[PDB]
Design a protein around this nucleic acid. Structure first.
Lengths: 31, 122, 48, 131
RNA sequence: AUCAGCUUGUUGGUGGGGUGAUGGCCUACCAAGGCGACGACGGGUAGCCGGCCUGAGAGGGUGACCGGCCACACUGGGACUGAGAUACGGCCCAGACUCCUACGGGAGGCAGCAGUGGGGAAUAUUGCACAAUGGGCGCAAGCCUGAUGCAGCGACGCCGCGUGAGGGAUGACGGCCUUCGGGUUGUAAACCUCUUUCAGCACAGACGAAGCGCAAGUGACGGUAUGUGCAGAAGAAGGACCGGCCAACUACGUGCCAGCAGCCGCGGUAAUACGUAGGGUCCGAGCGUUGUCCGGAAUUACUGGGCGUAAAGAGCUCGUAGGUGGUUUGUCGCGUUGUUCGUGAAAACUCACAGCUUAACUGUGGGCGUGCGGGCGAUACGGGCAGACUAGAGUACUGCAGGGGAGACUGGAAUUCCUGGUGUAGCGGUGGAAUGCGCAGAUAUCAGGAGGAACACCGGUGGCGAAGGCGGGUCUCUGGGCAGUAACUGACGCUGAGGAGCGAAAGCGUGGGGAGCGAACAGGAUUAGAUACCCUGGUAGUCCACGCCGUAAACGGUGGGUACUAGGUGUGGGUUUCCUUCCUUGGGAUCCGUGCCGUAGCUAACGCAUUAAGUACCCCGCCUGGGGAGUACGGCCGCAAGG
RNA sequence: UCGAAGGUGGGAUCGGCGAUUGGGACGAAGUCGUAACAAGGUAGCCGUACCGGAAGGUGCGGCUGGAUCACCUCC
């Protein structure tokens, strides 16, 4: 299989992890 | 799968996507023209498509396409809307019926008149 | 089309209660003796 | 483990047939011997016999090939299998190859073919198809 | 189940009560049960069926008319009367709403038939008669019946008929195209005969009524259907489409506009795709569009699909419920199978016949009603019961190979540091340099000491382990495998939803340790810029103890068990016959592994191919176009990261 | 006694709005960079951790779905 699919999945995962890191304290305080 | 797997879980059919959810099970709906304007199609084509914003009786705000050459629609105009997709416009799934309620049949049409609400010449 | 084995619980009535747990018994239907009680113990087929 | 001896017999027959073997050996049982009898009487195999093995008895089946080395069996399928078993009434008996094949049916009168069962008006379990 | 617990008259007993009747139906006492992953308890949606539509069938969708059952009658309770009560046009109470009132109080219930307003895309007359059928009362005549029989309106549907028929030409006019010749409309028209369906006019005029009535009469439909005369082709055709799918092409106008479009896609001054005209095709009192369902779709695959690389094998095991199960004897007749009886309303469907002028439609007689219940028959297979056997499975005994695991102790090389000699001016690093170290004595060399981590050669596509993974040596404890004998048990097997356990690295907690390496972080360099690659330093971490986490390209991208299907050649473990020196991979045979090459076969191909991705059987997991997204929400687990 | 409606109370559950705020999809021509595909010019990807305007960089372990190995003298 082409690595293009892995690249799309990894970019989605990386962006989501960045978003989670950017709002850790906000999530902790709202939950 | 195994027959036992089938008798344990069975087969679940694919779900059906509801089309033209604003009509609510009716062939047509009556609406009022929220705003009447023009807009441009997708990139491969180019024109000034005539599109109206209609508030239906199902309390759904819907954008509808006006077929034919010329139209006389303005604000607060009662129109009768039907289902139909326009490939160029991204999210337009409805068309205004010509010759019904306020919207008028087009002028000087002699072929496919019934599709544009033009009466036969006397 | 596969043959399926299914299980069901009924409540029977025996006066003296000679039937323990695990005994193969015989039952016959009858009129409602209470709520949910609709069977009558005929006799104990084999004890266990 | 071994679940279907009949299916194993049918697959031994099929594998030997595809490899043009003239002989196939398998452990013996009454059911296997009876379907072997039906196969021989219907002309699908040459002949069969039972020897004695180290523990029990064996089944020896001779495969029939034509003069030009063409197989006398075109297919062997197991219909009723453990799990999903198949029973047919005397009226809805299956047809194999539009009647050109033979369907083995286990009736209370023994092992019969579809035509025999239809003539005698009995049903049973559809063991296999031969064509 | 992004709803796992629910139940206290709740489960059972006894005595009473109650009822037409059994019964926690009610009650007192007694006992503590009952239901639930075969999904209780919740949430959503829904009148059910004969049937109807679709489909080759299986199946999918649906419950309009007609027919059966159910529930309700402004909303919510309640009884009364009665043989019988959700009591639609009954009662009592409460409530909302509408109306009358002298203010004290009263009245009402179209989801009966018409009708009105409103909602909506959208659905009809405030009609005629009890003549026929059914019903109530009456001895009866008779009375009542918006049930019913009819009529009115709506192409709303199905069916049928008409708008004419025959003849008519080097083929009129006109239109359109043109190569300017002519061609097409076109036998079409005009004209000459013929017939008049249905409409129009006149006359006659029903059956439905072996009925009702002891009166003399009695048909709502209806003076309708129908029949017979009269006149005259006379009063009667539109819609969609024509690039391909998919029958049917030219001209003019316009030009990325105006527009078309179900998809592919057509509009850029010469468009068979836009608009209009000729021509054509398909249908025809219809023709198109929209909405909804089935088909095509084998696209949820029981019939009838898949999972190496296209979406799809859980990271791996153990094991619960369940599913499934070797050879053989007897028995049962549960499944299975044959026959018979009852039932499966009518209608519908299908076959045949009959009646409407035909058809739709109607009737009659079969079939169907794929099912269930009772009797009787069979025992091949499945199952149960009672046995038997040893080929599966396990044990025993004798050998064998191994980095399998845990603990303790311990060895040497090397790196670093510290101390002491010798010893000088550079060392270090790179593609090239600079930061950096050294001149306070560095690097180099020698001796001594401290500490931590990893174990060169052996050492490989070789061994072991379920997988992750596992090699310095020794000792202790411990798991599995294989071979031979076949002594023992006698199907004890396989798989396994959930569940439990193990599970690289990174990471987390507490306490130690810290030589080398080294995220982060500092400088140096390169560069247009270097939050990098390169250099010099360097903290967590890497290590140990005890616990968390629970993921990986956890891959052979290949779940487990079993049987069968050409061979050739390496290599690991073990038993054995023959060349025999018996030294020797001598060679063979056999059992268990691990590679390569290759048939048949399979696959879209690549490839797989006895270690299958071949041929089959049993069980499990998973897939259903791509994004959104393994994300949000809810939940569970976790210290957190997060899963 | 039971008992509709009504009243009081504390919770369940389903939705709408919400100042502000997060990400997603699409958009010929805007700005910043070159990350991937040829060894894509530091092989790529997987889990994890840290860091950075951004693609991304680095450490640790893993995978091949990674390219090239000329000449190579004895036989």
């Amino acid at each position: 299989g082409s690595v293009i699919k892995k690249r799309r999945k990894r970019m989605s995962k990386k962006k989501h992890r960045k978003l989670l890191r950017r709002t850790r304290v906000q999530r902790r305080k709202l939950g | 799968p195994t027959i036992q797997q089938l008798v344990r879980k069975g087969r679940r059919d694919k779900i059906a996507k509801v089309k033209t959810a604003a009509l609510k099970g009716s062939p047509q709906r009556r609406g009022v023209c929220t705003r009447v304007y023009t807009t441009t199609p997708k990139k491969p084509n180019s024109a000034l498509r005539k599109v109206a914003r209609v508030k239906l009786t199902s309390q759904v705000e819907v954008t509808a396409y006006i077929p034919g050459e010329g139209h006389n629609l303005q604000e607060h105009s009662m129109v009768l809307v039907r289902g139909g997709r326009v490939k160029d416009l991204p999210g337009v799934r409805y068309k205004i019926i010509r010759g019904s309620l306020d919207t008028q049949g087009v002028k000087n049409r002699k072929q496919a008149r019934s599709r544009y609400g033009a009466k036969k010449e006397k | 089309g596969k043959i399926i084995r299914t299980t069901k619980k009924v409540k029977a009535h025996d006066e003296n209660g000679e039937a323990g747990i695990g005994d193969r018994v015989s039952l016959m239907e009858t009129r409602p003796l209470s709520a949910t009680k609709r069977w009558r113990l005929v006799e104990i087929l084999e004890k266990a | 483990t071994m679940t279907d001896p009949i299916a194993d017999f049918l697959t031994r027959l099929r594998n030997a047939n595809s490899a043009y073997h003239d002989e196939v050996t398998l452990p013996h049982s009454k059911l296997k011997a009876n379907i072997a009898e039906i196969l021989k009487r219907e002309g699908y195999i040459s002949d069969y016999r039972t020897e004695d093995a180290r523990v029990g008895k064996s089944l020896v089946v001779q495969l029939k090939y034509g003069p030009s080395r063409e197989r006398s069996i075109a297919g062997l399928r197991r219909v009723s299998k453990p799990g999903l078993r198949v029973y047919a009434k005397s009226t809805n008996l299956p047809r194999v190859l539009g009647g050109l094949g033979v369907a083995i049916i286990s009736t209370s009168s023994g092992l019969l073919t579809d035509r025999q069962a239809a003539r005698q008006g009995v049903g049973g379990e559809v063991l296999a198809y031969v064509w």
